[PDB]
Amino acid sequence: STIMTDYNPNYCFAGKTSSISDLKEVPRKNITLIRGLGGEVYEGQVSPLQVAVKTLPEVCSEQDELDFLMEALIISKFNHQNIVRCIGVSLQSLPRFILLELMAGGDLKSFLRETRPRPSQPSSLAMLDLLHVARDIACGCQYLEENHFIHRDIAARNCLLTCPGPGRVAKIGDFGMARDIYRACAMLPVKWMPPEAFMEGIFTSKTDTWSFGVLLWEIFSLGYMPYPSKSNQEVLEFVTSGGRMDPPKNCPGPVYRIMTQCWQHQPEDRPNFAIILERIEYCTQDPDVINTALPIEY
């Protein structure tokens, strides 16, 4: 790409600088698309390795090209089991591809909605399944925090699962907001943002702690939209004024208490991710938490 070549942006993560020349270019003849899944995401294979393929439309702006490169650089430099892997890229053929770990369980929000206990599947999910998802994402967030990377958009829609069934691992699977900020409103994820985002606009890992609290609410509600029946501005005014969400239906007290600590008004009063993990791990050990039945959706 001449835009990518002429600009040739550097990307810094964890004290190391990378650029387009550092990306692992997979020959296009080795890549086959199998089906569309979800911009466009396809299932593909690399000669074989099963992958997810993100594509860049051939009709795109110069900014879109640079965005796509920065997304590749960002994902390629992460090294953690709870962040989706990047197999490589194919940027020297059109349309351009980024090749990612296939996450056959799909996105977490959709999974929660589709796998809710119902009279026909009364035991589809248990509390422990939800705590394992929470732990998995908290582990990824702790890696980001330890590497001074602020995600800015932790939400169930941005988490992915390795498979639908038992043994699934949840991973962070989108970095678009971080990418936009690295390169730099009705599209802001207001419902995931702490009060101070709207005051001084200052982001820290404590902003990700707040968002993680909202993710935990999403998990234990089985995929409900946060602040049901409030608009973005209503939520902004609500949370600023000290308003917080009620516990999800049947949510154990100890889990709800993790949410409420994540939502402390003062950032310094919120737990870091090592503390969040410890609390999630204690909940997972407590028989009265894990023996709590999830509500049936009639």
Ligand SMILES: CCc1cc2c(cc1N1CCC(N3CCOCC3)CC1)C(C)(C)c1[nH]c3cc(C#N)ccc3c1C2=O
């Ligand atoms: C093979 C399965 C799959 C896999 C993936 C995805 C969706 C799927 N499916 C969508 C279709 C469903 N079906 C199941 C049958 O009923 C209809 C819905 C079953 C999940 C989505 C589109 C969510 C996805 N986004 C990604 C982003 C990044 C990054 N960075 C990396 C990987 C991904 C993936 C995936 O690997």
